[PDB]
Design a protein around this ligand. Sequence first.
Ligand SMILES: Cc1ncc(COP(=O)(O)O)c(/C=N/[C@@H]2[C@@H](O)[C@@H](O)O[C@H](COP(=O)(O)O)[C@H]2O)c1O
Ligand SMILES: Cc1ncc(COP(=O)(O)O)c(/C=N/[C@@H]2[C@@H](O)[C@@H](O)O[C@H](COP(=O)(O)O)[C@H]2O)c1O
Ligand SMILES: Cc1ncc(COP(=O)(O)O)c(/C=N/[C@@H]2[C@@H](O)[C@@H](O)O[C@H](COP(=O)(O)O)[C@H]2O)c1O
Ligand SMILES: Cc1ncc(COP(=O)(O)O)c(/C=N/[C@@H]2[C@@H](O)[C@@H](O)O[C@H](COP(=O)(O)O)[C@H]2O)c1O
Ligand code: NA
Ligand code: NA
Lengths: 439, 439, 439, 439
Amino acid sequence: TLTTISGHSKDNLALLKCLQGETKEKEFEISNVLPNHKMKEKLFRENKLKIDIDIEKDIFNYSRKNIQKIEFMPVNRLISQSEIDGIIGTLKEVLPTGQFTSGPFSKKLEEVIGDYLNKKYVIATSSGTDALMVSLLSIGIQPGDEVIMPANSFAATENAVLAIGAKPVFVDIDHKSYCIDPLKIEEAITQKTKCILPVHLYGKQCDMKRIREIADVYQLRIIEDACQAIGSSNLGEYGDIIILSFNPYKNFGVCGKAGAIVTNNENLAIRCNQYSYHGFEVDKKNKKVLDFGFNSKIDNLQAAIGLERIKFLSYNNLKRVFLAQRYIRNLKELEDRELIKLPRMTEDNVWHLFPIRIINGRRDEVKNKLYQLYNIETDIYYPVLSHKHNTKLVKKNYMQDTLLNTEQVHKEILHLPLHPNMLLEEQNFVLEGLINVNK
Amino acid sequence: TLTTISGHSKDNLALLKCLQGETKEKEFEISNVLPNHKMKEKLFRENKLKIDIDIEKDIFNYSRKNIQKIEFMPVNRLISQSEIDGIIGTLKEVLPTGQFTSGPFSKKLEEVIGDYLNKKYVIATSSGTDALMVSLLSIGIQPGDEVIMPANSFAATENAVLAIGAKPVFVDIDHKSYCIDPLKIEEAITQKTKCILPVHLYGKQCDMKRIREIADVYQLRIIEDACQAIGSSNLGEYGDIIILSFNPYKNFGVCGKAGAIVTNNENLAIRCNQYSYHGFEVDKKNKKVLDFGFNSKIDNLQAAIGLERIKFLSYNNLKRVFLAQRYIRNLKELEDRELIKLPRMTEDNVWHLFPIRIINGRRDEVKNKLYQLYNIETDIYYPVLSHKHNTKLVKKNYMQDTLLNTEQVHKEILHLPLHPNMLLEEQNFVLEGLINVNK
Amino acid sequence: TLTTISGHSKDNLALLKCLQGETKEKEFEISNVLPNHKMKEKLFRENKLKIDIDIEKDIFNYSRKNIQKIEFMPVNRLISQSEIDGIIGTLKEVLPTGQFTSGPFSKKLEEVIGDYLNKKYVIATSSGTDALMVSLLSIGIQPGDEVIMPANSFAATENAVLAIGAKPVFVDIDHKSYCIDPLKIEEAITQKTKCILPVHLYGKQCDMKRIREIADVYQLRIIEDACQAIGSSNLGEYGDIIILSFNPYKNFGVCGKAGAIVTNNENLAIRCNQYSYHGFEVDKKNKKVLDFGFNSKIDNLQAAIGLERIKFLSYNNLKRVFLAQRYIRNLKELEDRELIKLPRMTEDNVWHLFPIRIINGRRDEVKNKLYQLYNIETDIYYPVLSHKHNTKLVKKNYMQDTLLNTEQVHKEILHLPLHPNMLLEEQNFVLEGLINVNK
Amino acid sequence: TLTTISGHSKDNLALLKCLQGETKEKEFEISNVLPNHKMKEKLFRENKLKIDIDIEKDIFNYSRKNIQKIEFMPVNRLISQSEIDGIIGTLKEVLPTGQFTSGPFSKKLEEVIGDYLNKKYVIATSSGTDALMVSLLSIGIQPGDEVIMPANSFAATENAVLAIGAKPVFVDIDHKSYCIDPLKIEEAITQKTKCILPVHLYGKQCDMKRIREIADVYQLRIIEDACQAIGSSNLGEYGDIIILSFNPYKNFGVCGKAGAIVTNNENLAIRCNQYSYHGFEVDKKNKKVLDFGFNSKIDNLQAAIGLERIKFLSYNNLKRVFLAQRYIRNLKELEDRELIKLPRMTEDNVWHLFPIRIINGRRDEVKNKLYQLYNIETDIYYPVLSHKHNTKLVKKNYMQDTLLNTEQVHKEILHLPLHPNMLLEEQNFVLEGLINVNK
Ligand SMILES: Cc1ncc(COP(=O)(O)O)c(/C=N/[C@@H]2[C@@H](O)[C@@H](O)O[C@H](COP(=O)(O)O)[C@H]2O)c1O
Ligand SMILES: Cc1ncc(COP(=O)(O)O)c(/C=N/[C@@H]2[C@@H](O)[C@@H](O)O[C@H](COP(=O)(O)O)[C@H]2O)c1O
Ligand SMILES: Cc1ncc(COP(=O)(O)O)c(/C=N/[C@@H]2[C@@H](O)[C@@H](O)O[C@H](COP(=O)(O)O)[C@H]2O)c1O
Ligand SMILES: Cc1ncc(COP(=O)(O)O)c(/C=N/[C@@H]2[C@@H](O)[C@@H](O)O[C@H](COP(=O)(O)O)[C@H]2O)c1O
Ligand code: NA
Ligand code: NA
């Protein structure tokens, strides 16, 4: 039996189970899309999987290194020499052209992203925040319009709504995935609601079928904040517009800020294109057709960088899945003792961030001791809920919000270091620290 | 007498006069600031002016090259090999740090810009448009507030006002500089005015002393749109906030989008710093103190590129001034014949764009024949005035606006090719075509 | 314990042992001297050793590249693109100065070399041969004086002695290191002896403590030919003068001919400076104080090139040690079988060349079959001993010389390809041919 | 009548007389040899002399510049940006080859030089000094042999003879050209004399006819020191070997040290080739056929530089002749008043240095006042005669030497700044100082 690896999360998990022998029924080929470039070079020979693949030594370079300390996300580790070499070579081609803002590599990256997402229209933007603001204006959001969203995302999700004058309406998360609870959304719908803005937090997709069911009944749009979820299988099937970020810390990043708007909806795509560049008619600069717009297309220079770095996407995502499975398998004893709750392996998760829950009040102690006693940095994404910031807006509009689940989970969440060029020895050091602090 | 070349417009003009023998007892030294680095290596030795400089042959590489056509702004010509080699060098240093968005080059570029503008506080941003939006919010603009501005700037100026819900109030330009007429500002002030937004159009400064007199009487803020005017002597002396753009077409540009907010006002600088980065407290990521903000700081990668390219700013500004003077001197007869109006040489102008006025209704014919008969591209920055776009906003709010001078000048203006890597042979081709089409 | 990497032989061996995990709980910082520039960039982060270094994959770029032949020293492989980019950068600074022979980079390189060798005085010369000629004059060599030296060096060593009219007196090598046998020196001393000229052949130091013991008894000077040994720890400790070569094939080279004279002795340094420039008093051009001299200082241009290329010296020397250790370890079975003798790993060797001995008279067969059958070039440095040339000098003076060890070793020696930009795949191709030809 | 400009001194004088209108009946073409490249590009169109040549403005960029001070030979002025651009261009092709000592550009430069000199054999060397020493060894000079030479050359001439153990025998110069008096040579021949070493001092050729007549009678070689005289018509007609220097201050220089041996004598040329590289058989490295040799071939990198710089030779020599004529015409009055003696214009002089004689004891006064009062540097090439250095050799061997005309001339000689990129305003400043100090 034969699977063609598409570069997305489902097939990465299927390949991993093959690499580990949890399966032997299956043979693999790999498609020639750009996000598969590195995986194909590293793990395949003549479109056949190499026979002698040692995940520990060949993919993670395991060599019994002695570790002294763990930073959560050392940004030098997120880019490889291979990537740098490719970036320098492409920039030697782009720089003499003098096209750094407008240019032909933006269109190419838009097409690559459009193929990878199976979506007809892509507008590459100067950031995921800008993509979200432009997308909200394209569906007609006016000041005072309400947008339903969770309260545990990065500040950008709420800020894009606020920047255009609209009003966040917070809904509680579910009990299993850190995502907006579909069963709480309907009761928060008012005559002012226009949009549901679910977040695929930490790289895990929301239950989009149920959210679409509700949005159709209420004739609401869905804009999906997928800034942490590139590569997740079937991303965007039910959404009107899907928002990506290509910030450098994302699973796929450029070398600066960038993002994208993705849709099948031609009218919405056209309005996005106009809003993202000053309100001008597309291809008629200086001639406004919308009342205003932003200076929010991607830079040609970053698009060219991104066409190099996206070559590593499926492979780095495969490394993330392996790391996550290792945390799950090696921390299971702490969950069986009912000290922590672990994520479960699912076929949609791309493991941008790896959350655990430390229960019965111990989270701060565990995080503090990991750092002070074992020199392990862990982090909390994010440290303040949307309805709890020290702001005039919160004091004026959000003091009556209670989000029971979100608030309880927030007292328990802790993120563990997980990034694709981490060493297995580094993960072992984290694993030993977590076990030892819970003894 | 001994003068230090500071890298700004006044000293560049004095240097040009000395190179050309219009002043005699003049020694020069060159200040060792980054924007002078190229001028110091090309024209100075032992901190004195080289004796053997020939402007036409050494600065413009005149060779009697044969020219067959002229493009207005071929973007490959705006960056030199020397700049490219330096940009590859600094990319090799920045890329392995993995610092692409936040980073240390952003702070250094802010310090360089603060030194060159003699201002205490600089927030480097993701574009000049973003700089303008943030600055407007920093002075307290709320939806419905009015901003007094001209109607002949690039769309970005009005768009920044509109995107935060404010209302442009358009005032006519003066009769001599394409800038907002100070004598028409006061009658446009209402209870809703919060800011005057003069634009230093084409590289020429507005009459800021008069505008400040009015602003002080009405206790109004001034935000100066200086996106075209970097290098202009005494820029900002009377402004609360100055906006710069480092778009690649500007007199100084990076290799993508960027800009800056410059101020001596610490309160405004702090608010700018918070609104440019999600409303977070300064250095307190994910902890909001303002109600929202944007994702609008410069990319560290672009700051590094800008620290390399700004080395060319004073030298490129000097080449622009010489080109401008050459147009003025060689087209004098067409003005004496009352066919065109020429700019005047002034100490503040950095000649981002070179406007002439074709009078007696001939502008369209001169533009079209220059291209179709003489193979010379000219342009009109900008083709539609702010109150004349076919937008809902204009149809609803601006149909009674009459800006007599702006509208009359708009029928006569034409921009001639002017960019610092032009050949004098290319400028000669322009000049001959302008003379011939006006026989 | 913390060790500062100095960039010399001994600390490179300690660093390689740490990287390979032959020591534990060694931490490293790196000295900020110019010869360590590349090693600091590539291997350290915040003045600590990077945790994620994989020698084969990151330092040698191993990719299982297919190899079909091996050349011994392809000169295009001795210089990297990084070096070229830096050389072009510094040529852009030096060329407009017009300073190409005399100039300030020569001084800077003399200071760098003096700091690296821990010596007070450095005269940078036009070649190592010139450095040795000048040095011999500086210690007072007159025509007819004898200089004790080995017979297995490059011809330059004997040529410098002969060019000033002095007489080589050849002494046999020891049985373990290719270097002059200290126990054979005293018997060759006559009333004419003025200098002992040991050669640190192939990168390995001679036994300088014992040679100094003899020299002191007989009031002899020692000039050390260290032209192959830059970076060897404690070089020069017992020598009056040390000679270096910066020819492009050395462990550190420029892009042309250059070398240096290094000494703590101010009298000799002054006389070297005088003889290396026409016999002129120091800084007194055209005014002789010595009877004559040569035109033998370094070119300023080569000195500037040297300041760029030397940045790679410690890293390239580290790579050479790894390559040497891999030959020793992978060829051990052939020494066990009594087919070959291998060098030992020692803290002083910088591995400019990698000698083995092929015993039982098989050297010529193995060399020829490695080439003809296996497409591997090896070489013999040097093919003719000093007393065995068909020259009038040899036929008149050296026909009674018997140098038993030198002659026997000369029948067995064979150099294997070894240069820092070799691939490990290329070294594997050499290893396989050597194993195979000795089946 | 039609002349084809060959690039040598005679045709340059002819061409100068045409550019000035002192000849009417003469048409010019120019040959396509490398030393004519810049003159052909600058002054010709389709192998015809440009109609419109203004020597002052087109060749000297005369622009009524205001001069403050004169340095005798500022080395930054000896290289043009055109040359620098070409040098960077050729090194971008040379550096990746890794051929920096041995290489193919050396052979090309030898071929260009042999054609320019009309000689069959050229050995490009690491300096002129090295060329001279190798040449003397090639004709069989042994320690104690005598070499007849003048006492007023650069120290290299005598040093090369001394360095190999031979004995300079000084002969007085003539009354008209600073060159060895042929009428005083024969009286200095002893049974030890082996060679006459005339020097083409300051760019002026010695009377080689009468010298060759003497050498034939006595079976002596002639080695001509032409290190200052490249471009001189009919150079080397009568000499066995002609020495060149390509030092960067010469009329043609590289960017470092280099020179050449030029001969028609194949036996000498072969011996020179061997002595210049360690005594090895040609194309048989490491196999000595001579007793010793040097490391004295040109660097391939310098040969590549020289192929770019020699493009400017004929044009720069033309500039020198104009400057020299201009000094002669404008100082004529001082010679008429019997205060100075001036050179006369001749067809062989390439004007490397411009000598005058200040008579009646005033030379020191004029030199000192020119510098103290007028900030004009002049110089004396050379400050000490060969038999007057305070060296042990002079005390032992040359105290009896009296060279009447040399010594008298030496009391009178002063050199005036002359280099091709000098400005005519600079030369005017020198002229004015010279007149004003002599009234
Ligand atoms: C769910 C979601 N929606 C929307 C967005 C907005 O996506 P941009 O507008 O493309 O960032 C984000 C972005 N999040 C990261 C953030 O997690 C942190 O690492 O900090 C970086 C910023 O860190 P630096 O400023 O140091 O790059 C942010 O990019 C996001 O995560
Ligand atoms: C007065 C003023 N205020 C404000 C602004 C806004 O400054 P950013 O936000 O930094 O651009 C500008 C910018 N203007 C140029 C525009 O002239 C044209 O060339 O088009 C480019 C855009 O061309 P590309 O998209 O091809 O870069 C613009 O950058 C400006 O000129
Ligand atoms: C021990 C000793 N002392 C003294 C010397 C003299 O050091 P320079 O005078 O600096 O070379 C040397 C030099 N040796 C090399 C030689 O090994 C060979 O590769 O050939 C090149 C010559 O090769 P090319 O001419 O192709 O560069 C020589 O540089 C030397 O090795
Ligand atoms: C007649 C004659 N023979 C022979 C020679 C020997 O020619 P190389 O061996 O090629 O120089 C020379 C050279 N002379 C100059 C000297 O004039 C002065 O400018 O000083 C420079 C040195 O100045 P720098 O060291 O600063 O380069 C010397 O090169 C020479 O002139
Ligand atoms: Na933006
Ligand atoms: Na030499």
